[PDB]
Amino acid sequence: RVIVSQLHRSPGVFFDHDRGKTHSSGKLLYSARIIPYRGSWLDFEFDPKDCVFVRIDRRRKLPASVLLRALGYSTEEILNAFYA
Amino acid sequence: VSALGPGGLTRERAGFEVRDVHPTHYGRVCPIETPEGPNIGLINSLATYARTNKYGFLESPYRVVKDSLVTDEIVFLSAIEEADHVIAQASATLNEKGQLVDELVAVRHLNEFTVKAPEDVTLMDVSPKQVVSVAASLIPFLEHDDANRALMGSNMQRQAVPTLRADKPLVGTGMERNVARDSGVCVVARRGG
Amino acid sequence: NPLGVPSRMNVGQILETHLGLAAKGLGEKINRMLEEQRKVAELRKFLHEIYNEIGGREENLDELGDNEILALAKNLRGGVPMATPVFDGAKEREIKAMLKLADLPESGQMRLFDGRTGNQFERPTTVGYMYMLKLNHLVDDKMHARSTGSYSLVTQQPLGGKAQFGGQRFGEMEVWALEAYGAAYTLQEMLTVKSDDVNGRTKMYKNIVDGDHRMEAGMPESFNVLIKEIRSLGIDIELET
Amino acid sequence: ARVTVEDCLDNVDNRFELVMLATKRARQLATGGKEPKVAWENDKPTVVALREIASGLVDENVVQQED
Amino acid sequence: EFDAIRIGLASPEMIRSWSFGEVKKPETINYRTFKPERDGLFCAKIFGPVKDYECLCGKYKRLKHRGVICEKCGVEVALAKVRRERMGHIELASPVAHIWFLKSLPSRIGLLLDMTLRDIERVLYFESYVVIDPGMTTLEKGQLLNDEQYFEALEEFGDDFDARMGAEAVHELLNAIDLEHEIGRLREEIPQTNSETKIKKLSKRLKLMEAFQGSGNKPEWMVLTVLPVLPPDLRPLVPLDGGRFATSDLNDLYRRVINRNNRLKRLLDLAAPDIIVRNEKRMLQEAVDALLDNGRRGRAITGSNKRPLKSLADMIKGKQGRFRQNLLGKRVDYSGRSVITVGPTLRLHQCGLPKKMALELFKPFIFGKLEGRGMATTIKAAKKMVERELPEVWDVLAEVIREHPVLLNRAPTLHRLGIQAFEPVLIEGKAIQLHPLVCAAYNADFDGDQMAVHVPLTLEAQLEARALMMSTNNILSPANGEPIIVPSQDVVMGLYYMTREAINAKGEGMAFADLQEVDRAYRSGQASLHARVKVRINEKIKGEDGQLTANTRIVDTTVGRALLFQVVPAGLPFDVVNQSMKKKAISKLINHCYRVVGLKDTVIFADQLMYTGFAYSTISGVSIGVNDFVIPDEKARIINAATDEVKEIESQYASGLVTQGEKYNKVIDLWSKANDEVSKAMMANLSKEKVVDREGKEVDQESFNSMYMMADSGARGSAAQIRQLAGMRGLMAKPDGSIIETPITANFREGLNVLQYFISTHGARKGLADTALKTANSGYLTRRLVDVAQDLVVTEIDCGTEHGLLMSPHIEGGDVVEPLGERVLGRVIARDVFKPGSDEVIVPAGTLIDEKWVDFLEVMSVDEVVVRSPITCETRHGICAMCYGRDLARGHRVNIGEAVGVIAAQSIGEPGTQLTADNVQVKNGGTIRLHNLKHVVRADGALVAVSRSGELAVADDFGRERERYKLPYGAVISVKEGDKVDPGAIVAKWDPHTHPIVTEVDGTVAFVGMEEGITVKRQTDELTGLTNIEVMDPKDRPAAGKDIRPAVKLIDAAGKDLLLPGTDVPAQYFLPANALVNLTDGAKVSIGDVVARIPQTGGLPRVADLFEARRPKEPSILAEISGTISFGKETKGKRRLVITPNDGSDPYEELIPKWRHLNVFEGEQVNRGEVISDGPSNPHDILRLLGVSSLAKYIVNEIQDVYRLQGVKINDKHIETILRQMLRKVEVSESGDSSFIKGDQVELTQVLEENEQLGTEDKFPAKYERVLLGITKASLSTESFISAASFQETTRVLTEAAVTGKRDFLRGLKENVVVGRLIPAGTGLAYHSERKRQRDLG
Amino acid sequence: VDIRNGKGIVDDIDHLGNRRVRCVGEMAENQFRVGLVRVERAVKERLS
RNA sequence: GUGGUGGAGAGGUA
DNA sequence: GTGGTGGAGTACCTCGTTGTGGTA
DNA sequence: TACCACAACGAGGTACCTCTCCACCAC
Ligand SMILES: [Mg+2]
């Protein structure tokens, strides 16, 4: 027998802005995916109404503020670091 | 090199992106050697000079060229590192001293195909066969056959049957010696004597 | 068939055929000077003429005449093996020059003679030597055939393998094609008595060996299997008689 | 000759009832209960039945009466 | 016999009636003791005997008593097969909920209990209680509560408030439903509320209650107390060599559920803790769920294998998903297969056959014959001779083969020609010899195709094959009358080569007395095959029917054509072969001969023609060499010019004067033009590449380059392929669909660079990848089509309806796309046909249009006709034979019993694989005529037409419209109606570029409310580009100016108020934003003045979208009722333009949200059928507003556009038949005899209306609206549930049948298929007719 | 947020750089690691 | 008076 | 050999309906 | 209160050929 070399996606971060009719509008700078070599994949969705949603691989859309607060950044410190 | 299997796309997630050739496949994955049928493009074959990187990506050989002279040094390069360099086709006019004499030479700056000036080229390929597969390299006059028929020709070449008394093809691509040696079916002198 | 060339745009057949004709001509030629008991010098100079023509490079005069050249000619007597790279390969004019060197017709085409009528074909045809392969698709393992045999225990239907002496499946598209014709008796036959009728297959065997073709209809057991499983799904199923 | 399945199909203008009567005639042949009013040319009951109907010498009345 | 298969729910009583036992032991057969266990999954007490006619202890080994039950051996002695019918039950410790009725999209139990499935899911898992018998307490029946609330409620109430939890609570709810009382309450409540959603829910409740009451079904049976067990044979476990056993999934599921039930009973009898007992109840509920279905909730898995367990629903689905392999596929005996091989020595009706396949297939026939003639006395001897193959067996084998037709089919059968009958011929080999002409029908090349064989056994089947499926019978395509047994590549090459002319050839100019003389001269070799010669010939002409007129005529022809004519039958003029005989010419000649001479002679001609084509192609030394591809000398110069130009353009871009985007388009245009020039030059070079000398001066003639005949003859190849072969290959396209800015200058003879090959690889891989997905999509589409139209069969002979379709030649564009005669061929008329002068009956009535009649119509100036269609033919349950046109595979009219629906579906779906403006400019010189034109002449007579509906037709001198043009709103036209306009004239000078606001009134207007900044703005462009005032936007205006709208009050020049005709208000249309009022306020404007100016896929997906009639994302907004239109109120955000019809003002006019742009002009004629705002065209609103025939025409044109784009030809009969299948259902508005709103079969409506007319009251007759259904939707809504069950949604449709208690009378094709009965259509029509006769009549 | 705001460009999975080819060693090591963690948890349960 | 194949995976042909 | 049976590793289509809880 | 985003179900081509490989535990 022989083992055929598998060509697969390299683990890491990937940013997608593929236009889709999901927004029913022009386009969306779509989500980004971080893929681990082993573990869960975190997804950072971008809501059509200029909002950022974050979910685990098998979890529903949740706002990124939850993840920011869980990371320990303050609701204002995180904003001051990111938005400004 | 296949794309199915664990951690890989199934045949129900085919789409088109995985099943299509991109300029980044140049010299790394054979663009024409792949089985026609349900698994097309999903399961491909490496180029003749293909090479995995330390990081597992694909690297391809090229000769560094000075603005005039073609330096004999040879470098293996991955797709991401090919962006800056302007790559010239392996066949081009030469001044018998390494100087590209053509005025407008076909090149690829950032994976788009156009002509350029010899003063602008930075890398140029090793051999024209560095794009096709091993089976794809074995069809003579391949430059005169369309891509579909090349694919089928490779595929049936993969399914030949050894005859009672094999006879060497009168027309060959020179690669037959290489593949014959590389396959273990031939007894090879481990030590000279 | 030449007509397969222009549609499937692969000219490599024609160029390969021409070059192979040239190669075989050269092989026969060197065979004749070898049979003419030519001295080694003639063979060496002719070979150099071959290898100085267009591309690659000769390496002779580094080979001992009587040993190396004679062995090479003996091996080459069956035809000179050409080596053409995928894209750095032989140009058309190179093949043409070799052909005229091979004393063969320049255009690579000659008028042939019919092998039965003896009449020469009016137009010259392309002939030559082409590397032909035989694939692992021989009919000996493809010819399956079934009259009757074992059937699946669940549904009394022929097994599906040539290995299992199985019968082909008359897929749903086949039955559509059948009903597109007005042919319904054959459809009912192949649906019921040719397959999935325990009490029909035996009796039509009796009829056939008796020479009668009557084919009592019967009732497929696959449908009653569906009935049984639907009933096991807690769904009442019955016929109004 | 051969089966005149085209001209006879136009006479009845059905090409289905033709098959029906043909089946009954061939069964009459196989059962031996009747004679081929067409002279046999060494062939099986189906084709002789097709010739019988094609020549117009047998029809629904003829089949029923011969029954 | 039997009939009328039923569906019902399982009553535990009748379940036990079914059951032969109560399985209590989860374990099955003992491996150690080779026996099943009492109360096991295979217990003989329940299911029957292992070996036939035996008892457990073997006490009764005798076969005499086949029904007795022994004393020690309790299990009754009986036949062994009874293990397949006998079933058993399981007695459950608790009632458990059925999953299907719960997890189907409408939760049946939730619908019956009138609350959401969340609540029952809660209760099913013992999460919340529910009140039973609330009595006189604060609790209520629907109330559900938690543990703390439960304890509090028990404390406060104590009794008269029973709280329950679990599936048993649901069961107690079900039998306490008061179906009559609930139905009465729902009926009372339904009209009380006018809200749409609530009335919809109440309607569904009433439907369910009525179905239950009429069906006699008890809802309490929904939650089963006991469940049946599958008979052991259908769930067998098989052992393998080495002591391995392989058990079915159903056995594992049964073991699991029995285990859990035993757990429940034994923990229950000792009164286990309540938490533990409810937990076990829950796992038993989950286990029975997983048994009866899988993947819906839990997705149960097997042990040490990732493959999910295959539950019962997976069995009922069958293999291949829902397309039941066991039920419809059904592998067939007396079958075989092998690779094909071309047999050119084969007559059309015959095919080759390997000896071994023949002797294997016909083995019972061999046995019968051998026993008959006497060389076989025992069958062992017969087997002995057949295995040794004595020379004797070949004689009998040939005899049985002699007149036995054999049945052949390829793997992908896309139409009835994909499977054909042949008369086999024995050959020595292992391959199947095939007739070369039939390969086109099979679409089977000899590149390795395998061909499946079958043999018909009954005389019925053999006659069906010989008379209906013989290759000779089917010559013309069922899709279109064009022949399908047509000369292919090589024979076409031979024929074309024979029929050429050489300017100077041996023997030209000398004459022949007869064709035989020509053959004698040519075979002697003293005459060239193609030289201009004279020959007198004997042509038999059938110009008048009944007399075959023979005449002799001396003709100047070539030798080859004269030789060919000897093959042609005696019913055609010789002139039909005097031309070059290309492939299309050959097809036309074959079609002509078939319709003239007949069929037997037609096939004789076909075989002879093949023989001649093959022979003289063999004689011809036609061959391909590298010299054949000719590269024009000008190609190098053209390429150099293109390179120089593109280098100059690149330099210009680099200088910055040229932008990148414009440069890309410029260079691709340059390259395309250069490629076209190269292709044209090389084609001209090749075609005329022949210089010959004819007795002195050299001359030129048609080329004889081999590849040139390959192209021109049409045998093989195409101009595009020549372009790639001997010419520069043009632009290749990137994967994004963008054309690469650098082309491939080289051809294939020249060879390609690695880069150019790389790009060609992009293209080729694109095509190859798309191929498989296209095939899959086409397969799905054709399966849906055949399933939605399987039942439709020609049943009646003449409906007699006088409705048809006004059907005209395809004129789209400036040129005639499709001639009228070709469209009407094979159809039948629906009314009189008249001369241009009326009252002159040309074609009287429904007479079938034939070749004579189409030529007659061409003789006259017929342009528009109305033809009977299956959209007509109101006959119930079928289709009359007139409204469906002539049969396509037959020159004759269709016959009753022809499954046109299946034929139509196959024809439409077969070619799926092959798929993927200012002014009016007249084309030619013709008389100008106006259609649907409504406009008043301008002051100068410009006659600007602001009306939307209007078209311009350029009638020919005969009178027919050779072209038609659509006139846009606001089009100024040089109106000379009837005057011949020279070709290329621009008669109408429309130039919208904007939405102009016409002014049919005259005088000095008063632009009231035109505030400069609040409503208008005198903003002028640079260089005095305009002296105008631009209206202010409703948002960009001031806060008060936002509500201010400009209004040009219609005043005359002196001050007289002007008002629009019909309605008293002035034509003072508001001047919205982005308008252009260049006319000065108070300036008298002539009639038709532009007051305000407001500036404004294909392939299988398109046809699938049409066949589903899916609503586009933004459909074109269409008018409702004709009349006076109004303006929309943007304040609400939805433009409410009220309609004021003049005959009667109906204010009902919906408001279109401004999110979509509306191009409608306020205060105009509504034109009910017309479009208010542009966009893609929706189908349903055309059906409900424009009518039926209009919708059918639009759909047919839309589909045929896609099909004609690829050049594939299909008769409109098939698409129209599909359309008839779509519209089989109607919706009712006011019934008086049925529900208010119901999608019901139009047959039901017709029957009910006819009965009610001569019935109770004349007012009981119902008013209903026709409704359009997509094929997938329509097929699932068939009267017969079985067909939908075998199609898709098997769970859903089965649940509908169960809850509705449906009864299916097998009156469709697929039903008689699955049951194994004869087809209602075809030859089984007589059998079905007699069955109906004997059943209905006593 | 930069990509959404126009700073930078989206990634393209077409680039063979974004993909990677494994080799028998990689999946062999992965299977060995999986078996190793199973044996390790077994030992930790036992060697406690 | 008696007659012997599930599922998964992979590849290939048309 | 003959009773007896529960979760850390996996998530990577593509429409097209259909039903549902949210907001104007 | 009628649209509407969102989630779940349900479909996604025929036929044929070749190979290997098949629940654990556990006194
Ligand atoms: Mg083929």
Residue numbers in the entry:
A (entry chain C): 147 to 230
B (entry chain C): 535 to 727
C (entry chain C): 1116 to 1356
D (entry chain E): 2 to 68
E (entry chain D): 16 to 931, 947 to 1126, 1135 to 1376
F (entry chain C): 438 to 485
Relevant lines from the article:
AlpA positively regulates a programmed cell death pathway linked to the virulence of Pseudomonas aeruginosa by recognizing an AlpA binding element within the promoter, then binding RNA polymerase directly and allowing it to bypass an intrinsic terminator positioned downstream. AlpA then positively regulates the cell lysis genes alpBCDE by functioning as a processive antiterminator. In particular, AlpA recognizes a putative AlpA binding element (ABE) located between the −10 and −35 elements of the alpB promoter (PalpB), binds RNAP directly, and allows it to bypass an intrinsic termination site (tB) positioned downstream of PalpB.
To prepare an AlpA-loaded complex, we performed in vitro transcription with a DNA template comprising promoter PalpB, followed by a 68-bp C-less cassette containing a consensus −10-like sequence, followed by a CC-halt site, using Pae RNAP-σ70 holoenzyme, AlpA, and GreB, in the presence of an NTP subset lacking CTP. Extensive 3D classification did not reveal a complex with both AlpA and σ70, indicating that σ70 is released upon the formation of a loaded complex. The structure of the AlpA-loaded complex reveals AlpA interacting with the RNA exit channel and having the RNA 5′ end threaded into and through its ring. Notable changes include a rotation of the AlpA C-terminal segment as a rigid body associated with the loss of AlpA-DNA interactions in the loaded complex, and a disorder-to-order transition in L1 associated with the gain of AlpA-RNA interactions in the loaded complex. The inner diameter of the nozzle is <14 Å (the shortest distance between Cαs), which is too small to accommodate an RNA hairpin (diameter > 20 Å). Therefore, we infer that AlpA renders RNAP resistant to intrinsic termination by prohibition RNA hairpin formation in the RNA exit channel.
